[PDB]
């Protein structure tokens, strides 16, 4: 029996984007995803009370532009056989730095490390660990780029292999890519 984990963040509504794309929103039927792991930058509780609608288990991490400060700056969870680490990623300098992200992986002692902020999607394995960045679901802009392709990641967890699906909205048609990771 599969576990499906939704991974998304850097929404940045209302300031940077009005709402998540309807096309994305149509795919996230409530109940069909069991877990939700969010990198942060919602930022308003509008979205936090929205994410709750879609699944019973939802975890936020604190973003540098998140207004509810009680979110944890990082969270470690387990789903099936996978120990997952979650962090927004503004703590990593330079942004998305590999060596730094690796420490947080070993420090957190996780199989999969999720981080955001760079608004750039990543899903890859490094030294037998798997690193995910869902990118920005709204396509929100970062300090350096204005045409950022919206995207969110859905993890399919089956025993010791996670299948990671990324859906990025290029043009106005959802498109996806598969990346498979097995615990070593």
């Amino acid at each position: 029996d599969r576990m499906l984990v939704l991974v998304l963040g850097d929404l940045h509504i209302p300031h940077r984007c009005n709402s998540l794309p309807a096309k994305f929103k149509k795919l996230l039927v409530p109940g069909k995803i069991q877990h939700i792991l969010c990198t942060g930058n919602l930022c308003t509780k509008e979205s936090y009370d929205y994410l709750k609608t879609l699944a019973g288990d939802v975890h936020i991490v604190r973003g540098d532009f998140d207004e509810n400060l009680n979110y944890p700056e990082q969270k470690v969870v387990t789903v099936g056989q996978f120990k997952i680490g979650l962090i927004h990623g503004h703590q990593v300098i330079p942004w998305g730095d590999m060596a730094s992200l690796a420490l947080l992986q070993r420090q957190f002692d996780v199989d999969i490390l999720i981080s955001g902020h760079t608004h750039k999607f990543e899903a890859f394995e490094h030294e037998n660990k798997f690193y995910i960045n869902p990118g920005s679901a709204t396509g929100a802009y970062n300090a350096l780029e204005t045409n950022i392709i919206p995207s969110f990641v859905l993890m399919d967890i089956q025993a010791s292999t996670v299948v990671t699906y990324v859906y990025q909205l290029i043009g106005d048609d959802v498109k996806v890519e598969r990346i498979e990771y097995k615990k070593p």
């Binding site: 703590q91 990593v92 300098i93 330079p94």
Partner: peptide, 14 residues
């Protein structure tokens, strides 16, 4: 580097 609530420290030398 790693930005923490208690400082910002290099991960290694450099």
């Amino acid at each position: 580097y790693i930005k923490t609530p208690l400082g910002t420290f290099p991960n290694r030398h450099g």
